Every structure is written in structure tokens, then in C-alpha cells.
Design a protein around this ligand. Sequence first.
Ligand SMILES: CC(=O)N[C@H]1/C(=N/OC(=O)Nc2ccccc2)O[C@H](CO)[C@H](O)[C@@H]1O
Length: 504
Amino acid sequence: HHHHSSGLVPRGSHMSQPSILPKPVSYTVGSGQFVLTKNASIFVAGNNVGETDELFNIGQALAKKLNASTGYTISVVKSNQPTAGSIYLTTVGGNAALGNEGYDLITTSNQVTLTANKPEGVFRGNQTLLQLLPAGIEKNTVVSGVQWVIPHSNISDKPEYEYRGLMLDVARHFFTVDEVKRQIDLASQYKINKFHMHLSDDQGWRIEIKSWPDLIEIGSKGQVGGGPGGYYTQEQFKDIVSYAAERYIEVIPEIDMPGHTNAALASYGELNPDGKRKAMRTDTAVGYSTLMPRAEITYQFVEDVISELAAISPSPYIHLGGDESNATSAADYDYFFGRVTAIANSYGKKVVGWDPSDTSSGATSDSVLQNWTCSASTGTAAKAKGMKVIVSPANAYLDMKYYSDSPIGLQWRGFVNTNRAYNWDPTDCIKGANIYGVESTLWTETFVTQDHLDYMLYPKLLSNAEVGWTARGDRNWDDFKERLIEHTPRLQNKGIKFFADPIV
Ligand SMILES: CC(=O)N[C@H]1/C(=N/OC(=O)Nc2ccccc2)O[C@H](CO)[C@H](O)[C@@H]1O
């Protein structure tokens, strides 16, 4: 047999017809169609009144999206007796083999029925439902001249990996609550279910800590390149968490330590050996900063930060970073990371950390390794200790330029086009591990505007999202590429300022 790899498309990027991404476990189409009309209602029914109430909220979220593009005023009804023309969302009789996020979605001429095990699965299935309707449905303003049809179809679906995440770096350049919510919303439509906020680094500190107010008064006042920076109040952070929770997205906050800490060191002189505040940094160097690993004030500082963050962050996880502590000795790093893990655990939080944090003698089997290095030796400790692993290989470093000539992005992991972001498997990064899942990391050294974020995340994130959701056996670039071409108008309709990748 004859095989080939993909080159660029001749004559430039290519960038009744559903466009499901990520690819579902099964999808068949039959004769006939459902028509969504102005008289449609969404019916919801759970196994008890509390569950029905939860489904009702999910239903209203779906109605909101449908109403924006159709111009209808679809409303939601608590009833298990849907009427012809209805969408019906239910958890009664879900197929347990599909798990928490799985669902069946069967569209007949008279009715759309989404059957899941849990409300979470209904929400994930609704993302598929939106992709079954015609291009135009994802507009934020009313679209005329499009019949709102869904082909008779049968879908069953569940994720391959439990953790399918996006990290946004808000330290290097700041992004507003509105901007963050928008990225969470867009990502949720592709079944991303985790959002990791990199809230602190050398160039900025972005979360209000009431006990150490100069982290904001001093530490938040800049960013890479000398812009004004910004921060989230604790109320704003709670609002982001709430918005994510409505999309069944867990928010994992990161306070990077003991490295990547210049903003803290610039805020409080007492965190430095000489007692003086560091000058703020607006460059892009990494690796040079460190907390004092053998001073108790360091651990008081960390405890205060963790106490306040834990109080406002419902995720069972806090990310304590641990990357590039090049001004910290191996012995001091081992000791430091063990100490801060104990602090986090005492406040009821399990610790996530970048490699080599798994090597700390103070880690537990409940700690999680975020494996970004993806070398043969990375995560040897994690594996031995039974720690879950989240992979972030080169193919998930979405801040990498698509090509040599990309106008934004870095390139220390090489270029990452839409094909490279697709053509990998989590087992490529690490062998013999309990792989919890994948996280796409959007570092922001070179991204200043919302348009920059859109350009680098789309279509790259779509590739990563499919790697997280769709089983390896059913992933195929030639297939995905053609599906992505078909999906393009939907990106445009959403107002995403995507890159029209010439490999698509
Ligand atoms: C865990 C992690 O990602 N840490 C930092 C970095 N780590 O980047 C490098 O180590 N770069 C590098 C390595 C060798 C040669 C030249 C650059 O990459 C990112 C940009 O992609 C951000 O700067 C992160 O703060």
C-alpha cells in the first residue's frame, strides 16, 4: 500500500452539513430532518427534582445560544412529555458506559433527544447539538434566510481523557475578565473541560491577596513590554470561576513558585535576602528568580496566599508551578516544594506542578505532574509515586509560531502548525504513566490583544481538543483536515480571528 504525509495546499488555505469537532465515538445519519421553529421549547427531565433543576439551567444556556442566531425566544419546560418540534434533555436511563461526560444524541423528524448519565454529559452533548444545526447558528446576531434543520441522526459519545485543558498566561500580558470569559466560552464549545490560570510570574501578579496588598499595588502594575498590567479582585476571580462552572469547566489557579516569582519579590522587600524590593521586570527572560527557600517568612507568605486562594477556588487542585527554578539549588527545591505541598494539603488542596516538581520528596500520590518537558526521564518520580500526569508537549505549546514567518509567537519548541497540533498522542510524551489528560498552554510573552489569542488558539486548540477527546484509533489528519475546512464558517460566525492555516 501507498502512504503520504500532508504538504501545504496548492493555491492557499481552504480556510444538511453538521460539523462535529471533536469527532464523536459514533455518528450515523438517516433519512428525514428535524426543523427548529419559533415555537420550539426545550424540555428537561432528570432522575429527581434537584437534577431536573440543574438540567433546567443547562437548557436555558442552550436556549440563550439558539435564540441569539435564530431570533426566537425558545424557553425551557420541566417536563418529560416533549411535544413535536421540541428539544428534550434528559438523564433518565443514561448509558452508564458513557460515563459522566458521555451522551447519546438522537434526532428524529419530530424531536431532538439528548440522553446522558449526568448533567455534565448533557452540557457536553449540547456542544455537539450546536454543531448539528446549520452554519449560522453560532452567530451572535440574528441570521435570516437559513432554515434551521438537523438531519435525522444518531450519535453516541464519551471522552478518551478526563482532563482536557487550556492554560492562559495572564501574567506576561493581562487580559480582562470579559476576555477571559470569552476564551472560556469558546473553548467550552469544543469540549475543553479545564481552565488553568497562570496568575503570577516575573512580570506581574494578577490576584488580589488581602493580607499582602502590595502584590497588587506594586506587583500588578506592569507586564511584558511596559504596558499598565492589571489584576483580578477576589470578586472578579469568583466570577470567572462561576462562569466556568456553568460550562462544567474546572478552574485551576496557579501561583508559580519558587521560581517565576519576580513580581512578588518586587512587591515585598522582605521576600529578598537583602530586604530590598526587586525592580519590576518587563523583559521575557526566564529562570532567574527565586523565593528564599530557608526563610520562614517565605512559608508565611505562601500560606497566606494559599489560604486566601483556597477560600475562593472550589477546585480540589491548586497549581504551585515549580518550573525553571534555576536560581534554586536541587536540595532547596526538593525541600521547598515539599513544604508548600504540605501547606496546600492543610488547606484541603491537592497540588499540581510542572516537572520536575514530582521529584520532591514531599509530593504525595495525590499530587499531579504537568509534564511539559516530555523526555524519557521526565515523570519517573510521578510514575513511581502513582501520580496522575497531565501532558503538555511541544504539540500543545500553542504559543509556538505556526510557521517561520508567523507575526507573533515563540519558537523554542519549533513551529507548531495545525497539523503538528493534531498528529500526536499523549503516550508520545510519557510511557508507563497514568495519563490524566492534555493541557494546551497559551503563554503570552508575545500576545497583547484578544486578536492575538484568537489567531494562535484557532485552529490549533481544535487539534488539541480532538487529541484529548477522540480515541487514537479514530484520529486521522486527512479526516480532521477536511472536517476543519467544513467547520471554517462556524469560526468566522463566532467572531474568532483565527489563522487561515495553509496546511488546511
Ligand atoms: C513551563 C514553561 O513553559 N515555562 C516557561 C517557558 N520555558 O521556555 C523555555 O524553557 N524556553 C527555552 C528553552 C531552551 C532554549 C530557549 C528557550 O516557556 C513558556 C513560553 O513558551 C513560558 O516562558 C513559561 O513561563
